[PDB]
Design a protein around this ligand. Structure first.
Ligand SMILES: [Mn+2]
Length: 9
């Protein structure tokens, strides 16, 4: 989830 958020951002 951390990196999902990074990509989303
Ligand atoms: Mn990242």
């Amino acid at each position: 989830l951390a990196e999902a958020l990074h990509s989303a951002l």
